[PDB]
Design an enzyme around this catalytic site. Structure first.
Site, PDB file in Angstrom:
ATOM      1  N   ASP A   1      -9.585  -0.630   7.374  1.00  0.00           N
ATOM      2  CA  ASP A   1     -10.106   0.416   8.257  1.00  0.00           C
ATOM      3  C   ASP A   1     -10.831  -0.207   9.444  1.00  0.00           C
ATOM      4  O   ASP A   1     -11.626  -1.132   9.273  1.00  0.00           O
ATOM      5  CB  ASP A   1     -11.117   1.313   7.522  1.00  0.00           C
ATOM      6  CG  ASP A   1     -10.470   2.210   6.489  1.00  0.00           C
ATOM      7  OD1 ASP A   1      -9.223   2.237   6.396  1.00  0.00           O
ATOM      8  OD2 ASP A   1     -11.224   2.910   5.771  1.00  0.00           O
TER       9      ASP A   1
ATOM     10  N   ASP B   1      -6.801  -1.662   1.697  1.00  0.00           N
ATOM     11  CA  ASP B   1      -7.184  -0.703   2.724  1.00  0.00           C
ATOM     12  C   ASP B   1      -7.817  -1.494   3.849  1.00  0.00           C
ATOM     13  O   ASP B   1      -8.752  -2.263   3.622  1.00  0.00           O
ATOM     14  CB  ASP B   1      -8.185   0.308   2.164  1.00  0.00           C
ATOM     15  CG  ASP B   1      -8.524   1.430   3.156  1.00  0.00           C
ATOM     16  OD1 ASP B   1      -7.613   2.011   3.789  1.00  0.00           O
ATOM     17  OD2 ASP B   1      -9.725   1.754   3.290  1.00  0.00           O
TER      18      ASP B   1
ATOM     19  N   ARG C   1      -5.872   1.410  -4.511  1.00  0.00           N
ATOM     20  CA  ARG C   1      -4.876   0.882  -3.577  1.00  0.00           C
ATOM     21  C   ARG C   1      -4.889  -0.635  -3.596  1.00  0.00           C
ATOM     22  O   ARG C   1      -5.894  -1.253  -3.956  1.00  0.00           O
ATOM     23  CB  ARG C   1      -5.121   1.403  -2.147  1.00  0.00           C
ATOM     24  CG  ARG C   1      -6.384   0.851  -1.462  1.00  0.00           C
ATOM     25  CD  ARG C   1      -7.625   1.647  -1.866  1.00  0.00           C
ATOM     26  NE  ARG C   1      -7.344   3.073  -1.774  1.00  0.00           N
ATOM     27  CZ  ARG C   1      -7.640   3.824  -0.717  1.00  0.00           C
ATOM     28  NH1 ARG C   1      -8.262   3.296   0.331  1.00  0.00           N
ATOM     29  NH2 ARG C   1      -7.327   5.111  -0.722  1.00  0.00           N
TER      30      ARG C   1
ATOM     31  N   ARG D   1       0.842  -1.206   0.000  1.00  0.00           N
ATOM     32  CA  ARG D   1       0.000   0.000   0.000  1.00  0.00           C
ATOM     33  C   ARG D   1       0.874   1.253   0.000  1.00  0.00           C
ATOM     34  O   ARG D   1       1.722   1.417   0.869  1.00  0.00           O
ATOM     35  CB  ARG D   1      -0.932   0.016   1.216  1.00  0.00           C
ATOM     36  CG  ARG D   1      -1.651   1.355   1.494  1.00  0.00           C
ATOM     37  CD  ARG D   1      -2.806   1.577   0.532  1.00  0.00           C
ATOM     38  NE  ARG D   1      -3.533   2.824   0.800  1.00  0.00           N
ATOM     39  CZ  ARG D   1      -4.549   2.935   1.652  1.00  0.00           C
ATOM     40  NH1 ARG D   1      -4.952   1.879   2.352  1.00  0.00           N
ATOM     41  NH2 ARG D   1      -5.151   4.108   1.823  1.00  0.00           N
TER      42      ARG D   1
HETATM   43  N1  APC Z   1     -11.144   3.874  11.946  1.00  0.00           N
HETATM   44  C1  APC Z   1      -9.931   3.974  11.338  1.00  0.00           C
HETATM   45  N2  APC Z   1      -9.311   2.919  10.761  1.00  0.00           N
HETATM   46  C2  APC Z   1      -8.116   3.043  10.150  1.00  0.00           C
HETATM   47  N3  APC Z   1      -7.433   4.205  10.070  1.00  0.00           N
HETATM   48  C3  APC Z   1      -7.953   5.340  10.608  1.00  0.00           C
HETATM   49  C4  APC Z   1      -9.252   5.278  11.277  1.00  0.00           C
HETATM   50  N4  APC Z   1      -9.536   6.514  11.725  1.00  0.00           N
HETATM   51  C5  APC Z   1      -8.513   7.321  11.357  1.00  0.00           C
HETATM   52  N5  APC Z   1      -7.572   6.619  10.688  1.00  0.00           N
HETATM   53  C6  APC Z   1      -6.325   7.215  10.162  1.00  0.00           C
HETATM   54  O1  APC Z   1      -6.455   7.429   8.752  1.00  0.00           O
HETATM   55  C7  APC Z   1      -5.117   7.574   8.276  1.00  0.00           C
HETATM   56  C8  APC Z   1      -5.036   7.465   6.759  1.00  0.00           C
HETATM   57  O2  APC Z   1      -5.581   6.207   6.372  1.00  0.00           O
HETATM   58  P1  APC Z   1      -5.996   5.944   4.841  1.00  0.00           P
HETATM   59  O3  APC Z   1      -6.172   4.483   4.666  1.00  0.00           O
HETATM   60  O4  APC Z   1      -4.877   6.533   3.867  1.00  0.00           O
HETATM   61  C9  APC Z   1      -7.547   6.807   4.504  1.00  0.00           C
HETATM   62  P2  APC Z   1      -8.643   5.780   3.490  1.00  0.00           P
HETATM   63  O5  APC Z   1      -9.029   4.524   4.164  1.00  0.00           O
HETATM   64  O6  APC Z   1      -7.952   5.435   2.087  1.00  0.00           O
HETATM   65  O7  APC Z   1      -9.964   6.647   3.214  1.00  0.00           O
HETATM   66  P3  APC Z   1     -11.228   6.719   4.208  1.00  0.00           P
HETATM   67  O8  APC Z   1     -10.675   7.110   5.550  1.00  0.00           O
HETATM   68  O9  APC Z   1     -12.077   7.767   3.529  1.00  0.00           O
HETATM   69  O10 APC Z   1     -11.849   5.344   4.201  1.00  0.00           O
HETATM   70  C10 APC Z   1      -4.365   6.472   9.003  1.00  0.00           C
HETATM   71  O11 APC Z   1      -3.006   6.871   9.149  1.00  0.00           O
HETATM   72  C11 APC Z   1      -5.069   6.365  10.341  1.00  0.00           C
HETATM   73  O12 APC Z   1      -4.284   7.006  11.347  1.00  0.00           O
HETATM   74  N1  YH7 Z   2     -12.760   4.377  -3.353  1.00  0.00           N
HETATM   75  C1  YH7 Z   2     -12.968   3.146  -2.665  1.00  0.00           C
HETATM   76  N2  YH7 Z   2     -12.054   2.773  -1.667  1.00  0.00           N
HETATM   77  C2  YH7 Z   2     -12.233   1.561  -0.960  1.00  0.00           C
HETATM   78  S1  YH7 Z   2     -11.151   1.133   0.202  1.00  0.00           S
HETATM   79  N3  YH7 Z   2     -13.339   0.700  -1.255  1.00  0.00           N
HETATM   80  C3  YH7 Z   2     -14.292   1.083  -2.307  1.00  0.00           C
HETATM   81  N4  YH7 Z   2     -15.408   0.450  -2.782  1.00  0.00           N
HETATM   82  C4  YH7 Z   2     -15.943   1.238  -3.758  1.00  0.00           C
HETATM   83  N5  YH7 Z   2     -15.155   2.344  -3.890  1.00  0.00           N
HETATM   84  C5  YH7 Z   2     -14.133   2.249  -2.987  1.00  0.00           C
HETATM   85 MG    MG Z   3     -10.779   3.416   3.883  1.00  0.00          MG
HETATM   86 MG    MG Z   4      -7.751   3.309   5.393  1.00  0.00          MG
END
Ligand code: APC
Ligand code: YH7
Ligand code: MG
Ligand code: MG
Length: 160
Positions: A99, A97, A94, A84
């Site tokens: 979360d 991901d 990516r 990633r």
């Molecule tokens: N519930 C959670 N789970 C995972 N990361 C989290 C989080 N809340 C905040 N973050 C923070 O979000 C920061 C960036 O994570 P990313 O994966 O780049 C955002 P993303 O998941 O691509 O988009 P999204 O947050 O809109 O889903 C991480 O460094 C982490 O510290």
């Molecule tokens: N932009 C997006 N990012 C992630 S992690 N999952 C998705 N499913 C549909 N769109 C998406």
């Molecule tokens: Mg995300």
């Molecule tokens: Mg994330």
């Protein structure tokens, strides 16, 4: 003190089926933790720039006794294991991901963590897989997952 954490999985680069399978194995290797269940794999059109591949999205229930940010340290390792690339913009493609959608019934607002995930209630591709593995789920604010889904216009997802 064991807690159930619900983790969202998204992947749209470098063979998402392999990426997710690798992520699931690694998630089970997190110490003091094990997977209780996992949703089906779903294929979803991208939310974001349209010139990227469709996503594989899934949800996982992870029983764990780790602290939330300790768990985050492990899930971020897993993302890096799968190559990633960390970026500021968040709607682009990516390999993986991970979360944390929910961590028990906890509300978390730190520099590194916002739990419940700030946008999950507006994303069918997070809610539907979660509903598959936790149909009776109730959010910390007390809303029911089922009620949210059957109330708002969330198109159902196609399986991968
Ligand atoms: N519930 C959670 N789970 C995972 N990361 C989290 C989080 N809340 C905040 N973050 C923070 O979000 C920061 C960036 O994570 P990313 O994966 O780049 C955002 P993303 O998941 O691509 O988009 P999204 O947050 O809109 O889903 C991480 O460094 C982490 O510290
Ligand atoms: N932009 C997006 N990012 C992630 S992690 N999952 C998705 N499913 C549909 N769109 C998406
Ligand atoms: Mg995300
Ligand atoms: Mg994330």
């Amino acid at each position: 003190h064991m807690t159930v954490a619900y983790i969202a999985i998204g992947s749209n680069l470098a063979s998402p089926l392999e990426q997710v399978n690798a992520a699931l194995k690694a998630l089970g290797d997190i110490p003091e933790s094990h997977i209780l269940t996992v949703s089906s794999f779903y294929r979803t059109p991208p939310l974001g720039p349209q010139d990227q591949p469709d996503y594989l999205n899934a949800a996982v229930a992870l029983e764990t006794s780790l602290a939330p940010e300790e768990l985050l340290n492990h899930t971020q390792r897993i993302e890096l294991q799968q190559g990633r690339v960390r970026k500021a913009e968040r709607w682009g493609p990516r390999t993986l991901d991970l979360d944390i959608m929910l961590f028990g019934n906890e509300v978390i607002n730190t520099e590194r963590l916002t739990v419940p995930h700030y946008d999950m209630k507006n994303r069918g591709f997070m809610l539907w897989p979660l509903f598959e593995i936790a149909p009776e789920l109730v959010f910390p604010d007390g809303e029911m997952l089922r009620q949210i889904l059957h109330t708002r216009a969330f198109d159902k997802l196609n399986k991968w």
